Design a protein around this ligand. Structure first.
Ligand SMILES: CNC(=O)c1cc(OCC(=O)Nc2ccccc2)ccc1OC1CCOCC1
Ligand SMILES: CNC(=O)c1cc(OCC(=O)Nc2ccccc2)ccc1OC1CCOCC1
Lengths: 107, 106
């Protein structure tokens, strides 16, 4: 069922975006704010871009959606220090993310 | 190539000796983890990574990172956020990233 998947992913993504630790991940990181970011990170990802991909019917499987969302987190942990606010936010939001996937029974 | 090999060996060994590595040392058994292999399609562990290393599979940083990252993401996907295993995954992942940055791999 394609619109089953779509509705579930929309719901999940929207809850992730509304989470209080989502703020670092809402938009493409700007080169002005992140020194040499696009030299280090070859596959940049963010929640805006994920919203568009969703709207564009790109997420035809769980696996694709997970991959982009995990990329958000791995980009962040690759680039930032472990005790930085952004790294902490990545793990809080990841925990939340997994709890919402488990809730939905996405399999 | 033996530059890469030595660096990866060193990193992997340090990861395996870390006090939070214990959940990841061997393949998870279906007897101990209900429906694990239904949820997790690409299982990974540090024993298996040691073998792959010895087997000269890790010809690039990217391949090594991928398998090690998979160890953590498998664990977080399957376990509760406040479970001991989930906590260990993040402690060990932090340690891991600090060691790869130290070596100038990523
Ligand atoms: C997911 N967001 C980031 O990874 C990020 C990192 C940023 O880090 C700057 C920096 O100097 N980081 C750094 C510090 C020490 C060592 C290496 C990198 C700055 C803005 C960043 O993007 C956010 C995008 C919108 O929210 C505010 C900033
Ligand atoms: C990386 N290891 C695991 O993910 C794991 C999960 C296991 O599942 C236990 C379990 O019931 N987890 C669970 C708890 C609440 C809800 C769903 C699953 C069992 C053994 C597991 O690994 C073994 C424990 C450490 O010793 C060797 C491997």
């Amino acid at each position: 069922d394609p619109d089953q998947l779509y509705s579930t992913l929309k719901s999940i993504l929207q809850q992730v975006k509304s989470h209080q630790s989502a703020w670092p991940f809402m938009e493409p990181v700007k080169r002005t704010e992140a020194p040499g970011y696009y030299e280090v990170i070859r596959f940049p990802m963010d929640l805006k871009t994920m919203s568009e991909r969703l709207k564009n019917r790109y997420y035809v499987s769980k696996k694709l959606f997970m991959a982009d969302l995990q990329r958000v987190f791995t980009n962040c942990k690759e680039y930032n220090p472990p005790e930085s606010e952004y790294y902490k936010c990545a793990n809080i939001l990841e925990k939340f993310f997994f709890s919402k996937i488990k809730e939905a029974g996405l399999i």
